[PDB]
Amino acid sequence: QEMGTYLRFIVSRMKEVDVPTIQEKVNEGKYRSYEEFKADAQLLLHNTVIFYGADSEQADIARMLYKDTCHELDELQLCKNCFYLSNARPDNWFCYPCIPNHELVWAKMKGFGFWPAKVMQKEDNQVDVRFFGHHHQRAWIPSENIQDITVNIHRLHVKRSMGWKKACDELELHQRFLREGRFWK
Ligand SMILES: [Zn+2]
């Protein structure tokens, strides 16, 4: 059931065996698992490969479509609450807490000063973050370019643009929602 909510988002974005079939399979609960859904997306790609050739521009386009679809499934697995909110986008959607809570950090992308962000996952040498601010940019950040959220940021390289200020405002609203236990709807 909840599966239908998420897959609906994915198919809807897919627009932009065939897609109408997949859509109605989603709506009629025909997929027992995400893996069944992904297999139909794969079959869709393989049919394009068959029809036009493995080296065709049609294949290239279809490969990226499948890749984009699989990316959505990866993101869903990373955190279903983030995926829901990032798709439904109520007001202040990025401010609502998740469980477990995302680690918050200051992160510097190459070329930029520090911006606040949520940690999505990590490995020893780099961290996958989603930034606060209007564009909610996603990026891998080298571990040496991360600072604890509790650091005095006035000390460090930042550019206090309006976008940045808005990101800090969004960060503070998020920390408040955490303290309030204000969970989405
Ligand atoms: Zn989350």
Side-chain angles (χ1 to χ4, degrees), residues 1-15 17-185:
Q1 152 61 44
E2 193 182 43
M3 212 190 170
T5 315
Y6 300 132
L7 293 184
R8 235 153 275 148
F9 285 132
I10 292 177
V11 173
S12 163
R13 276 159 80 131
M14 222 177 101
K15 286 153 160 149
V17 89
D18 51 51
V19 184
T21 309
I22 290 170
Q23 168 147 264
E24 296 318 330
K25 277 177 80 168
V26 166
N27 291 334
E28 305 164 18
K30 297 300 195 187
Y31 295 111
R32 299 180 103 210
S33 71
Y34 289 114
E35 290 62 44
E36 275 185 350
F37 173 83
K38 186 171 159 165
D40 258 355
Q42 180 191 329
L43 183 54
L44 174 58
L45 159 64
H46 190 252
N47 288 348
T48 307
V49 163
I50 288 330
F51 200 74
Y52 291 102
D55 69 335
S56 67
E57 288 164 284
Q58 287 89 358
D60 293 341
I61 289 155
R63 279 176 186 121
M64 293 298 95
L65 192 81
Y66 181 60
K67 160 175 200 279
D68 287 343
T69 294
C70 294
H71 176 63
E72 294 301 315
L73 293 176
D74 293 339
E75 290 285 303
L76 176 55
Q77 176 58 36
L78 264 190
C79 176
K80 67 172 180 173
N81 196 225
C82 281
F83 186 85
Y84 182 82
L85 286 167
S86 174
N87 280 273
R89 303 212 166 195
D91 291 348
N92 303 310
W93 61 270
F94 197 63
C95 295
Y96 290 95
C98 300
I99 308 286
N101 294 353
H102 294 274
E103 180 183 7
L104 306 169
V105 295
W106 293 98
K108 164 165 74 161
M109 260 181 300
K110 257 210 177 74
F112 295 76
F114 283 93
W115 275 63
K118 294 183 190 183
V119 176
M120 300 304 291
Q121 53 179 342
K122 56 179 131 179
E123 56 180 29
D124 284 348
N125 301 337
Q126 56 176 341
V127 184
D128 183 8
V129 311
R130 188 158 204 193
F131 287 97
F132 289 88
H134 188 258
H135 297 283
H136 294 109
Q137 336 236 37
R138 253 307 253 308
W140 287 92
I141 306 288
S143 283
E144 74 267 16
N145 296 358
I146 278 98
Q147 294 282 321
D148 200 278
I149 204 69
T150 63
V151 71
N152 177 190
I153 206 44
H154 301 159
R155 295 285 162 284
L156 321 171
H157 175 212
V158 314
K159 186 187 206 262
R160 297 188 147 67
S161 62
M162 219 68 22
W164 184 88
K165 284 179 198 153
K166 305 256 172 90
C168 292
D169 289 353
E170 199 187 15
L171 166 67
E172 178 46 43
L173 186 59
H174 173 59
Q175 285 177 313
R176 180 183 155 200
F177 283 10
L178 279 175
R179 291 186 302 260
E180 290 176 336
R182 191 194 299 230
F183 289 93
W184 167 247
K185 97 191 294 323

